[PDB]
Design a protein around this ligand. Structure first.
Ligand code: O02
Ligand code: O02
Ligand code: CA
Ligand code: CA
Ligand code: ZN
Ligand code: ZN
Ligand code: ZN
Ligand code: ZN
Lengths: 519, 519
């Protein structure tokens, strides 16, 4: 029998340095986690112990901290080469700086295959990008050969900036002919490595004949067998077993996000490449694992240029700024209220925009207050990494009512469309059918001398400050894009929040009942 | 028969210049009201028409605008002498700058008798103040004589700063022997002129034998017969008829506040000084009455020194700052929220005071936004004229619960104890018995990383920022004074709100459900 050890990361999102338990900037070094130096140490311990090891990445290395803001993907190629990744699948955030932002710093510099079977290039781009990413790779592992086939979310055009020249096909339709090709070349051990979310990973495991293992990302899924080591609640056992249509038990794995864990799956194969069994668990990369000094020294060398974004203190917080997805995609989070209050305050400088809506998935990180409360550009850069704008927009009450129904239409799945608000008091009843969950919606009046809250009226018009991402129909808010009456472009997102914090000096945004649930 | 015309003012509170309909600074001159130049014109028109006229003041000329801040009562003696007041009764605000603040600028400079029968001086003060105010005066009016007897609120020691050396006796007990003295001197026409509120004015009319008329103040009572000319809703007919214990019909009058109206009561007496009948109404001092140019010119001469408090713009408001008593003593008013937000913001500069309570009677004026939104020291001086401080205090939840029960214990009478809040969400049910009207009370947690609202606990302790007036048991909040665990003195009230506004630049405080009523 032949044993393979798959080590996998996903949704690392520029967490090159070690971080806090909430994946924000490391303050108390004794309880810090993750980061590529610590990962390098654990990978090395496994490569010493196990003869057949593959180190895989399921996408979204791009976007998340000042590392990516400054180095634009060169830190990813440099530190993934130093860690000796065997393969990587393209994620949606790999296209955030267009195709050239992917081609030049990463595709042309990676010393490992970068994969995606369902991305087809067309027109002039097709010639330049040929061979820079591959539909699959066959990798020698000891005396055997392992096929790895890539896949990328079909939603990348709606989430990122891949351009017109790239077509994202259905993953199952694009994967089957590649897996069939590998089987004709007698590759009997096949890993599907990709970035489409756990639900799609489960469908690929079921529908794509010949796939032995699925290693995914995108949904930040935490899977565990037994008692979990930190705050992440497991969504299922590790590995997650799917029984395929042809009757094979297919393990599906994912390792949360931000380099906090290293996925570890041991697979026992027979001579014909059949999975006899498999077992493992994500390894928490906590303080007990030492950071490799060679990688840490090289990180400290690259950190010098980034220290210009931490020397200038913008303001000070006396509260934890909860920008976690567990809060911001499920309920009112004070990071949401802060950003919506900065949005309204920057604009109100004799203009009358009283209302704000902000997608929870746009808040990419919390900020900690225990470093004497100090907030820097570096801290803000991880909360608002996209370089978007906060736009003024004019909407009918009916349109706003539909947006709030979309905010909770499939609540409970940690999706980014949950809205954080300002100048709005919304009440939900999740017991009701999707599309009819908003039980109360009051808005701060504008055509009144003393502003107060009153029921929203379907026939009335309202001025709303919101990200350009929402104004352009992002996160399924097509009603905002289709039904809006006016859309003006506003100032840069990070500059708006920064200018607000420096004026306030000390901030203490609270959760105050802007969003409520009715039992 | 002999006819007397009584013209009366009360609670003018330094409104020497004409003002807006809400009694705040005049912006649109074409719709402005009151002010002493306009009053002088209407008084003159009546003195030309009627041979027997008395111009009376029932107290509280002191405190209210930059006029009093700067001239400290010299403007009151100067402009009351110029208007030719026949008599004035002492109010509680006449003692705001102590006994010397009353003696020197007003008592020693008034060319008319100043009255109070129930104020008895003791110790060294008794010698200095002898003859400076009188228990009564007998005034010649044509061929007849009219006795005027003064009275001042027994609550002046709890509201103002009269010192230890002055005793405020029960008005009824002090008035009867003075009215009896006037009757032995054969003065058959007696006016009780004083400053104790409409309820006490009604009791004096009933219980003090020999009083023909009561002219009051303090409660800002608006009385009218017929269709009223402005926003003030009448509390009864003008005059208000009380039937005394000895069976006489006694008219009781009051003329709202701030010099917006001139009280006008015509009384028909027989030869034995019996009131045969009476009639009249408060005259609205609106734009249609011209300001007397001699008084206006003299006001413009005195206004030069006060223009140093209007040249410096503190900030800008884009909302009406509702500091009216009709809002601030009955429900959440945004002037209250603004002041409580300045109170918390000034203090939070690693201190953790999340809560604020502010008596509604401490907000002495609104601010208008139609002068391009500009806010000046002059505008703030009329909102916060006392020169008090916003103190930090430590209270048991039980104590805070009792203070909120006191806030609405006799709701509906426009009393100053209604509390404006910050970092507190209170719900009242007025249907319940007094002392049991608070149905919900949530407070912003402090021993938590993310502040949120949670039910107040009786056994827990809380840090609260509030005026020194409240910390010292003012407005019947004896439980705060008796039961507090710690009381530190804070910064000056007006400087705290000013420093806040200049930092914010544009303010837009809203009514947001901090205070609610349950049906
Ligand atoms: N607010 N701007 C904004 N701009 C973008 N370019 C953008 N791309 C993704 N998002 C948000 O991020 C959410 C997806 O986050 P995750 O579930 O963690 C998958 P991801 O790692 O972003 O590919 C979406 O639901 C959106 O709310 C984005 N939000
Ligand atoms: N907040 N400070 C403060 N300091 C003072 N020195 C003071 N004196 C009076 N008040 C408030 O003013 C209210 C009385 O106002 P009115 O009913 O208009 C009678 P007034 O003209 O003040 O004598 C009281 O209930 C208090 O709330 C006062 N409030
Ligand atoms: Ca196989
Ligand atoms: Ca009489
Ligand atoms: Zn991701
Ligand atoms: Zn993704
Ligand atoms: Zn008064
Ligand atoms: Zn008074």
């Amino acid at each position: 029998m032949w044993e393979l050890t798959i080590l996998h990361t996903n949704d690392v999102h520029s967490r090159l340095e070690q971080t806090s338990e909430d994946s924000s900037k490391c303050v108390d070094a004794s309880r810090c986690m993750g980061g590529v130096a610590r990962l390098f140490t654990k990978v090395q311990q496994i490569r010493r112990a196990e003869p057949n090891v593959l180190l895989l990445d399921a996408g979204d290395q791009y976007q998340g901290t000042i590392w990516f803001t400054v180095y634009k993907g060169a830190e990813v190629a440099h530190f993934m080469n130093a860690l000796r990744y065997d393969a990587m699948a393209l994620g949606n955030h790999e296209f955030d700086n267009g195709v050239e932002g992917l081609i030049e710093p990463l595709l042309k510099e990676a010393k490992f295959p970068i994969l995606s079977a369902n991305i087809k290039a067309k027109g002039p781009l097709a010639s330049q990008i040929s061979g820079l990413y591959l539909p699959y790779k066959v990798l020698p592992v000891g005396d055997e050969v392992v096929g790895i086939v890539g896949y990328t979310s079909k939603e990348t055009p709606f989430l990122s900036n891949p351009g017109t020249n790239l077509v994202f096909e259905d993953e199952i339709t694009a994967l089957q002919p590649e897996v069939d090709k590998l089987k004709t070349l007698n590759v009997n051990k096949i890993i599907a490595l990709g970035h489409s979310g756990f639900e799609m990973d489960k469908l690929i495991a079921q529908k794509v004949r010949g796939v032995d293992v699925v290693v995914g990302g995108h949904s930040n899924t935490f899977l565990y067998t037994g008692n979990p080591p930190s705050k992440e609640v497991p969504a299922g056992k590790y590995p997650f077993i799917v029984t395929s249509d042809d009757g094979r038990k297919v393990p599906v794995v994912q390792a949360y996000a931000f380099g906090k864990y290293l996925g570890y799956l041991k697979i026992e194969f027979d001579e014909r490449g059949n999975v006899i069994s498999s077992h493992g668990n994500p390894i928490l990369l906590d303080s007990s694992i030492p950071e490799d000094p060679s990688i840490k020294a090289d990180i400290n060398k690259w950190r010098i240029k980034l220290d210009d974004y931490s020397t200038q203190e913008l303001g000070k917080t006396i509260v934890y700024l909860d920008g976690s997805s567990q809060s911001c995609r499920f309920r009112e989070c004070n990071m949401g209220n802060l950003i919506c209050d900065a949005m309204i305050n920057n604009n109100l400088r004799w203009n009358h925009v009283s209302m704000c809506i902000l997608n929870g998935g746009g808040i990419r990180s919390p900020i900690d207050e225990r470093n004497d409360g100090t907030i820097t550009w570096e801290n803000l850069a991880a909360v608002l990494p996209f370089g978007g704008t906060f736009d003024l927009v004019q909407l009918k009450g009916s349109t706003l009512k539909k947006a709030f129904e979309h905010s909770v239409h499939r609540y409970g799945q940690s999706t980014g469309e949950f809205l954080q608000v300002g100048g709005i008091h919304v009440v939900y009843d999740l017991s009701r059918k999707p599309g009819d969950r908003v039980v109360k919606l009051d808005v701060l009046c504008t055509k009144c001398r003393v502003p107060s809250y009153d029921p929203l009226k379907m026939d009335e018009v309202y001025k709303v400050i919101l990200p350009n991402f929402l104004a352009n129909g992002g996160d399924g808010f097509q009603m905002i894009k289709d039904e809006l009456l006016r859309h003006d472009s506003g100032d840069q997102d990070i500059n708006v929040v920064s200018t607000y914090i420096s004026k306030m000096k000390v901030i203490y945004p609270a959760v105050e009942g802007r969003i409520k649930f009715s039992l």
